[model samples]
Target: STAGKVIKCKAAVLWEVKKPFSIEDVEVAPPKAYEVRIKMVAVGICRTDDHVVSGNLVTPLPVILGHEAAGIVESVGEGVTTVKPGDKVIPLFTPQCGKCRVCKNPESNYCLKNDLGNPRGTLQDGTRRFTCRGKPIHHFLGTSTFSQYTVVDENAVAKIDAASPLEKVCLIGCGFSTGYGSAVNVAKVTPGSTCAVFGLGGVGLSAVMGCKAAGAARIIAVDINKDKFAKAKELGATECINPQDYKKPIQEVLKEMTDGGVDFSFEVIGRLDTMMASLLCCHEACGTSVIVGVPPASQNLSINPMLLLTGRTWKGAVYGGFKSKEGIPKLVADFMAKKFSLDALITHVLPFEKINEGFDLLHSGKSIRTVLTF
Candidate 1:
């Protein structure tokens, strides 16, 4: 049963295609069947959000931009039995419907329920749920957590303890999941194994965290900047390298440290150079390289075909092979257990009104993660 009155909320919106975000007063309606309305407390400022807002990734115009967020459920619609009012939750960019093919399997990242958008994210029966000046605004990533209050399908939300800090837990939604999962879940790094992360940005640093958590003996952190080592060292990185200082190539650096190449290499930056470097950094025997970065649509990666013949494996990752509903809860548990450092990973917390300033910090390399608080 519907349980709430309509509420007016403030959101940082990108009103036109290829433009900056603007603060606007928007209306959040009551939830409908199998949906829930959430009062967002904090949203992570991720590279993906920046990519979409800058028009690098394609999406409908005038859409709300955040995906990594945690908040309290304000109300629930009819047939929404999964979660209820006042439940703390994380909004998952990928909805996990267990009946689907991908959700039923452990290895697949393609959860069909999220891909098809069954309810079409319209209203209960495929009608629009949000409006600005009487015109409907499409949801982005089925999350749209940039808004102070946003409606999402019940399956898209993963309930968490109210005790966990919103600023830290929100990162488990996307950035942390992608980086950590790539090493732990996707690559399944073996204990005592050697690994290298190609970039030490938010995602790369998280990958380093996962590598350490997985019991990797040597976690090599690579980046062009020397300043990134402090953050990487605090997150369990065993060795740090400046990519610019290497003489032969990235592969040589890994070889010198590991006595050969690393067993697993992760590319957290989407550029072709870093992607290729990730592949080359892997050992000839049973080495695997994974690309976690999302590049622009028009950009294409070029690589030497001969590298594959030598036993190096190259691949891509989304959400770190996360089964949103199942994986998100476990990640939260890990945080509460003190198994990882979500707090140190976060550098700043800016209000929704200062979102642009947050992005400025991100672009200038001032913080590992800048969270947007509502």
Candidate 2:
């Protein structure tokens, strides 16, 4: 049985920052109590994972990097009742332990127990599960899904519908939800309201779809590159604008175009300037803006006090305010129901071994999301 056996598998292990992932024969240990071992089926490439590789997002070395993944339960640890072998699942980077303080608050989905704010590269139990060269390797976000088999606590997994497409719905694990939830849940975007989304990556495009689905009267997508405009408009962006086309700051241009400002603005680019621009481009009163990007760590945002004093609310949410364990499955079901389509977002598909090629596509700006399947 797979339950008590140590599995040897192929995994892309990042031995150090700024170094390419090295394919290694790694030993994956069986799950302990409250832990679940997952057989990763598909994973999406995200900018956050690139941040780690670029040395911008810091984490421990020699770790498995992918977290945006969908998998099946290979085996469950003792005392784990929610999932079992053969059950389809998705590994959660934002683990939701129901007893935590933030988990108890209905408005809060950033569970305190998971501690995503701090990157330890280990599970909650504080031990390593994979080993290379007989040396223990650290985990990543407790998901460590770059490997064929990964171990995470029960809280770090969501049981998904068996019939769901692991390849397509895998985007729902991170990018899709983060942007979709930002518009629907975090901003509470209203129908007939004008909305602006800055950036046109997979997440920003998702925000555009969200605003469209939310019944927004207008959805203005902004990006520095005009090449992205076509896809942006295709994904429900009523209009797409390039910041470089204007002589004045884009915010002022948007402010002038909308007469007042938009009712909702989202900063989907992880830049301080765009964050501030998104804030300034919203209505001075009764406008809400959400920061959907991962800004550089150890950096601070400089803001004017009156920017928020007048009633422009600036908010941020990890995973777009969706409680990971509970919310991911619902989002998956919505995908199954064809509530919205992300087929455009899946711009490229590659075998799991061509992961570096996937990253190349991401850097080239030619691909939206590159799904890697084993």
Candidate 3:
């Protein structure tokens, strides 16, 4: 609630492309019209943040990364009403302008106007208010949650019960929503179905949880690290695959596990090989392979025309094909009800000053969801 002054806050900024984040003192602007100033309490380190750091996803330089986050509303701009100062909230990476056709559609994740190459915090007027070193540092997604304080459109922030811990619930912002929604929404996983999830990172683990919530009969989790399989099992994976053990093709191994192939296979590792593996693991006519990972900028996936003709569906998903404003609050309620395991997904907690350390953990595969706490 620090108001009526220029606020100095600690933030991790990528001053250069393909470099580590540098901790710096950044300015927090007051809320503009229809915007709200959030004192970010907790931000999650997601793969997209890594993509921004690695330059896999193009964005304006000197951007602040982090989209999966939760905070408290510190101030509200003129004409804002959905939330007010003191409300606990999660920042949706995609802004949901209700009037947009996609926002009015059944699925909220497909808001077409919000993600048009430009970042979300920029007002409809086409100017950015976030700056550093007397230069504009564009926001990543609309959140720029790597910073301690950030301004977002009211449509992008969802109010939650104040009793919830921002550090724990923050994951609902991205990875949790992306993975879980991929299963529950996009793939529409059915009960008693057999599922294979490639990669046991934050998104994959959340998918495992989604499979469990959907009553999948056999949820097989595949990961390079054997230890990750254990954690996935605890989170609801019915079986585990060590990639090393499958020196033979993954499809062969998956076929043996399901007695043919699985009903649904999710590729979260974001590689052509894994994408093919997900497809090969699908049952002959009823299987659907969902690609939730983003590959390198220049990489391409090749699929046999016969595979597509056989009724094996291959598709890509963004934020689990969910509209964040509509999906995030439901996720929060699921977290509160103990129906989902977001708290379990967070394996490390680093301070805002040590935010880059969380990325290091991510690169090393030693952490699941890393939280940056203010």
Candidate 4:
């Protein structure tokens, strides 16, 4: 019953780029109008958050370093109607206002109003609700779930089924759905097709899961690390290969394997070379390539425009093109319906206080996803 009053709680704050996370006592203010405050139940350590940690993807400093999470609504501010106190929710980093142009489009999930590209490290009102030692802490995306309590814009949060497992469903917030929906929704992978998923990380593994569920006949999982091959095989990869084993370009090897290249290809590694390889590895005339991984902010992909002229459809998406508010609940329902599983993606679980340990596990590439329970 700590509603309406400032809830003093512990949170993992990253005070500097490439610095350690500081477990500090922070004050979480009550939600404001059109906002909801969440009591984080479980969150996952993701590479995107790692970007903030390693100074690769810089945002406002002294910010909370978590996003993929699920929680229970602690309170609601004025005019908030989407969720109520005690409702279980998944915070939306890719919020859907339903008023933005992208929201109205069936093909787009990147909401223009989310302000993700120009992150000020604050809420919609340009203010941060988390404070430590009288200093405001910048939020990681709009959904900062590292803290015991976090404030999110109403449109940025979705209420899930009451019986849903908060710990497992938290992966749905980012990794699982990001890759799954990219395969199912955006790419619209057809049955009996061939899928080449580059990078066997959390998102790419989920992409493999989606491709298999879609009835893809051949699923080729690509990665440099052999340690990830077994997990990829478990998730549905028919063949696993490390590019280091090959002397020629990875794309050329795939071409030799698939005859003319794969029916569909995805780049989840976020490297320019991999991105280009993913595109070139597709069928020369009709294959589709999706850039699922986020590349470095300062980087760009230079392409031979002639490749697209031959008829390849190159596309990409944010949050797996699941328009948060409307799509996530249905995806959660699908999870409950046993259409897929989350257990495969979650490799480690720890108490929220062990947040740094979880981060270290992710950085070491030993854990697919580390769940930190609050």
Model 4: CA > 4 A from native: none
Candidate 2 TM-score, C-alpha based: 0.97
lDDT of 4: 0.88
Which ranges of candidate 2 are over 4 A from the true structure?
Answer: none
> What TM-score fits each model?
0.93, 0.97, 0.94, 0.97
Candidate 4 lDDT tens digits, 53-148 = 876686877888688999998899999998999899999888898888888888788886565687788888879888899988888788888888
Error of 4 at 323 (Å): 1.3
Q: What local distance difference test score does each model get?
A: 0.81, 0.88, 0.81, 0.88
lDDT of candidate model 1 versus the reference: 0.81
Candidate that beats the other on TM-score, 2 or 3, i.e. the better one:
2
* CA shift of 267, model 1, Å: 0.6
Which consecutive 10 residues in model 2 have the weakest lDDT in total? 110-119
Among residues 3 or more apart in sequence or in different chains, the pairs in candidate 1 whose N, CA or C atoms overlap within 3 Å are 123-127
| Model 3 lDDT-worst window of ten | 116-125
